[PDB]
Ligand binder design. Sequence first.
Ligand SMILES: Nc1[nH]c(=O)nc2c1ncn2[C@H]1C[C@H](O)[C@@H](COP(=O)(O)OP(=O)(O)OP(=O)(O)O)O1
Ligand code: NA
Ligand code: NA
Ligand code: NA
Length: 153
Amino acid sequence: MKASRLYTLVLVLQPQRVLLGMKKRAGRWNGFGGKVQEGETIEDGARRELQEESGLTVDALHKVGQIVFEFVGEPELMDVHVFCTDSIQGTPVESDEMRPCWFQLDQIPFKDMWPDDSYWFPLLLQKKKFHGYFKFQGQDTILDYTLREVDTV
Ligand SMILES: Nc1[nH]c(=O)nc2c1ncn2[C@H]1C[C@H](O)[C@@H](COP(=O)(O)OP(=O)(O)OP(=O)(O)O)O1
Ligand code: NA
Ligand code: NA
Ligand code: NA
């Protein structure tokens, strides 16, 4: 059995568009998030990372999924808690590491996203909740995965 490290992932999903961030320093679009820190709830860590990485604040988030990632050659699992919100305060801000961009929901840039997103982001769009697991060789190749719609995350 492996140890896991906690991470967050936040999708700013509006009725016609989604906000993603491009990793600059790279080339992949993703939600916003990072490692949960000592002492904070997972939801508060998600809000903190959204603000640190995009400039956006939100009063609250909705938890929509949990995904565990395993990478060949890495002993630690990434336990990613996935949140959405439709309600935002301020404008997204580009940094040296991340460039935010809105995409229309008929132009979701799946080929330039993590490959797993093609499987779970459709569920998120349908207001479904999910649990997933994906094993990767490097950045591009999935060797094994499981995905399940759930009623409670
Ligand atoms: N396969 C995958 N699919 C996906 O959609 N998001 C993934 C993913 N693998 C990792 N992520 C997300 C999870 C989390 O939001 C982020 C990884 O966290 P980071 O290493 O960026 O955390 P930190 O911001 O704490 O790190 P530093 O900025 O290096 O301190 O990438
Ligand atoms: Na971060
Ligand atoms: Na961080
Ligand atoms: Na991050």
